[PDB]
Structures are given as C-alpha cells and as structure tokens.
Amino acid sequence: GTSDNSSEINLVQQSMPNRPNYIGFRDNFVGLMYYNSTGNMGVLAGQASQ
Amino acid sequence: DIRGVLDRGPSFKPYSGTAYNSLAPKGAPNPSQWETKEKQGTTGGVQQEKDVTKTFGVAATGGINITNQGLLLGTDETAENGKKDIYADKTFQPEPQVGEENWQENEAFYGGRALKKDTKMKPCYGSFARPTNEKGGQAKFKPVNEGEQPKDLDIDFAYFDVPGGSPPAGGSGEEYKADIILYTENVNLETPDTHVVYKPGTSDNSSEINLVQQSMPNRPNYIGFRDNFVGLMYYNSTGNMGVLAGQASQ
Amino acid sequence: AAAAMTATRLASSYSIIAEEKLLALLAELEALSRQLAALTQQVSELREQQQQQNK
Amino acid sequence: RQVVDEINYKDYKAVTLPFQHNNSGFTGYLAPTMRQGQPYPANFPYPLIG
Amino acid sequence: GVEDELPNYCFPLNGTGTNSTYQGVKITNGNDGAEESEWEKDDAISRQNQICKGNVYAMEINLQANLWKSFLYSNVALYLPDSYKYTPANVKLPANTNTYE
Amino acid sequence: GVEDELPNYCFPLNGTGTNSTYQGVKITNGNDGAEESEWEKDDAISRQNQICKGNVYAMEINLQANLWKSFLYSNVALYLPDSYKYTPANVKLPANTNTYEYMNGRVVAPSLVDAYINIGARWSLDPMDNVNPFNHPRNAGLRYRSMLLGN
Amino acid sequence: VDGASVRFDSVNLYATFFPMAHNTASTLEAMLRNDTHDQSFNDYLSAANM
Prior knowledge:
This is part of a larger assembly, with six copies of chain A and one copy of chain C.
Chain A: no helix or strand
Chain C: H1 2-13, H2 19-54
C-alpha cells in the first residue's frame, strides 16, 4: 500500500540491504595535490633569485 | 590457418547441471494429467474417464470471478467491464501470481496451466518447451489435423470445485461453482540434457505411478581442440610426410 | 552448398519554439512594415508631384 | 558464443524479458522478492546442445 | 558483510506440498452465475485431483550468511582465551587446564 | 553451471515431523490371522507410543544453484546501466541520477543475467561491456584502502 | 538482397607478341635496356581525389 501506518496490509514487507559503497582515498593519493593545473602550481626556488 | 566448420556430436555438454527450472526439486512433477480408471459405484462402478487425472494443477494467479470464458482478471473501463485472460499467451503466466504476498492473499478464485495427457509428463527439473508465439505463450501444439492445415491453438478448460459445499444453488443439490480453472494443453516437452534416473514402472505414459520421477542432470562433457593442436597435422608418419624441397632440384 | 552459405551470409551480413524567438520575430516585422509604409508614401507623393506639375 | 540464428531457422519466436518464464514458480517475477508462481516447463533459453 | 540479495528457498519433495482435494465440475448450458455450474461423471470426484491453491509451500534460509557465521564459529570464536569460555551447568570437567577433556 | 548432482535435504528438528500415536499389541498364541491381537497393558495404550509410519519429512533445496545464482546477482546484475532497471510503483526517488538514493531503489529483474545465460561460455555480458569494472565490492584494490581509514 | 551473384570458374591471361626477327628484337631489347631511355607514362586524369 501507499501508506506507512501500522496495518495488516503493511505487515508484508520485504527489504533488501542497501548495496555496498566503499569510500576511501585514491591510490597513491592521486588528487590530493594540484598537478598540471595553471590556476595553482608548485614552486621550488632559491629564495634569493626567485 | 585452417578454417572450416566443425560439429561436436550430441555428446557435447559444456555445463555441469541444468539450465531449465534448475531450482526446482529433483522430482517435482510438472502440473499435468493422466487418463486412468477410477473405482466408483455402490457395488462397483469403475469408469475410465478423465479421473484422478489433472492430479497436479498448481494454480498461482487469481481473479475476480470465473465465467464460462476464462478467469476475468479484473474489472475495466465502463466500455467493457469484463476482461478475461488471453489463453494464447497471458492465460496464466507461470511467473506472476496473486499479490506476491504470503499473508492476506486469500483470493476468491485461482487458476493455472497444465499439460494434457498426450504429452508424456516429465519432472519439472530439466523440462523445456519451445515457445510458439512471440507473446511468450508456451508451446502449444496445433490440434491434430489430417493433412489440411494447422488451425488455431489447442486449449481446453477444466473447472474444479471444492467437494464440501453446504449451500445449495437456490434449492438444488449440495453442489456449487466455487472452483478453480486450469488451462490444459500439450506442449513440445523435451529434456535437452537431463535424463531420468529412477523410473518406477516400465512404460512412460502418464500415470499415477509415473508421476514419481527423479532425473539427475546429464554428465558434463567438454569438446575442443588439443593442446598446441597436436594431431592436427601428420607428423613422423612415413605414409604421408610432407616436404620442403627447393623448386629447381625438387 | 555455396548458395546455402551465400543465403546464410547475405542475411547475416545485414521541439517547441521559445517565445524569445517569436517575440523578436514579430517586432522585426513591425519595424520593417512601418518603414515600408513610409517609403510607399514618398513614392506615391513623387508620382503625384510630377503629375500635377505636368498638368 | 553461439546465439540462436533468428533468420535461417524457422519456428523461432522472439520472446522479450517480461514474458519468458524459466525456473517459474520458484523465483520472483521481475524482482528479487518472494517466490511466486507455478512450476511449469521453461521456455526462454533455447537449447544449443544434444 | 556477506553478499546476499536473492532469498533462497526450500521446497517440499512432492513439488508443491499440497493437501486440499477438489472435484471436477463442468459449467453447463446456461448462465455462469451460481447455479448452472454442475459436475459431470467424466472427472474423478471423491479423491479427485488435488490442486495447490496458492503458490508453493516453502521456507527460506539466509544461505550466504549461514556460511559466514559457521566459518567464524569453527574458526577464531572457538580459539578465544579461556576467560571467555564458560562451562555448561550440567557437565563436569577435569581440574587441570591443559587437557583435551 | 552449478556442480550439483545430489539432492540437498532439510530435516525437522525433532528428527521426524510425523506425530502419529499408537498402542502396543500382544497377538496371542493363535494363528496370526485377523482377530488374534490383545493389546496388552505393557505399552502406551492411549498416547505415548509415537512412530513415523512413513518416511522422514525432509524438503529439498538445490544448494549449489542458489549460491551461484546469488553470486551472479550481487556482482553482475545490480551493476547494469540504469536502463534495464525499473522503479517500483509505490516508491518515490529523488531527481538527479547521481545521488546514492536514486541508485538504491531501482531494482533489476533476476530474469536478467542468471544461471542460464551463455551457459558454457566465457561471454562477458554485452549490456555491461561499456561499464566501468573498477567500481565494485570486488575491487580488492579499493576496499583495502577503504577499510584502511576505518569503518 | 534479392538477386544472386556471379561465380567465376576459370581465368586465363592472353598475350599476343609481334613476330619480330630475333636479329632486330635483340637490338630493340639492347636499346630499351639502356639507362638513357626508359618508358614513362602518366595517368590521364592525373589528379588527387578527395
């Protein structure tokens, strides 16, 4: 039925478990550091002649 | 790079087990019928008719009311309030049933499909029946025709009332019509792999004894070329050797 | 056999218009129509002006 | 794999999913729900052996 | 978690486990109302065919989960330190610990 | 296919579901004909003698079929592209397809890939040929680092 | 779709030689074997079709 109140009609419920969904970091953390994006790039300079 | 077309014999079967009704118990009989003699009469009235036949007629789908046409699944638009079942395909699709709910599925009238006595009934495990119409209708032999033409399909109706009915039909006997219908017909029954292990009797014609029927699946058998193709080209045989001679000196 | 194989092989081988467009279209037509009516008046006057001077 | 030849083979009827009934009466119909139905000979998987 | 979405059922040996017996009736010449349906001698009657009404009897079992639990109990569950295991009330055991008894 | 050849039975807890009752009988010295029994007062004349006059009350189940069928469903059926799966009438779903709620209420027919599809073949199911296979509970390279952070 | 097809059974190559005295065919062959003069032809259409 199209209801959630307690009744004999709603006594027939069959429920499947939600499908599994793992959530973790990417391997080697591909993504945690900006590579090859012009908006933000790393820098390794000599601190004297920048 | 030899290229042809081979044909593994009937012995070929690359899958262990069965493909048709694999979940059915090994011994569950198909809902069918078996012409026989039933003992009756006050002092002996045995009458060979469509007796205890139709012994298994499992009926899943239900309907509002049974008429002399079909099951009458449900009421419809005011234009045509009666909606029987198309006995071609959607007479009783074996998958659906009443409700799909165990409790409170009590239905006034049910119905199902069954096999005629012409078809030699086999266990449900490993039974196949090639469809006849694209609408999913199960195998339905065209009725026996001498030499003229295959006409419309072969379907018959059987009605089964519960024996115990108190109310008479308006002053009649103790009979009534609270019943269950069954669409009975013959199909192209054939077991592609499974073979019967335990056969109680000797004949295979449908009967109460022959209802007991257990069939294990056929023994798997793979066919294929040999490793590295051994044996495909003649080797170290003096009868037919093969050469690599130069063109000039041969 | 080749014909049977050939027979086997031949078969085996085998919008709703937006009002933005419409309202723009109507305005353009009216703008051209008013210009066209204005140019018609000048030509009609020109013929009368020559005709009356000749008469 | 070897699929059924739909052209060079007569008495071939195309059965779509919501009509084919294999393993009927012991498994849910178009759902992983209860088992509903009536045992009966199967019809969908065309034989390819024997 | 053990992967299981299809319920697994156990079915009776006779195929359907039916018990109710019906009798044949042939609905006659007239209206398909409540009379006019009358039985005929052509079918059996008294022990006449039994038809399952209503789907097969059955009972299910979480097949995949049972294997997972059984794997756990025979494994580590039995190999826990003795502080967890409790002796049954109505049995007796040897005093010393290091013994198969 | 399923490597099944023996029926697998399930038996009642009490050893036998038969609940018939009987009483002992004490056929006398006479010939064992029709009316020589005496039913002496040595057995349960009324209730207790319970015997299964028939066979045991097992019921069958194809153990091997269910496991393979269940493995096939969870691992190859639920991951079909969102065109073979339908939506039950009484269940409401969100709008965008991407959300987890949406891809959790649309069911797939078991009459899809099953124990009887491409039997005896190495065929990869064509509907999910162009479906990312690195999105799975079997992606052992993922759930190692999914459970590395914890649960 | 409808009609049948051709079916080759045998193919042969025919070639007719001008009957020329071996005295002058050797001379003509001697000239044509020279590096200075060799046959050169051009495609009549002489175009690159796209």
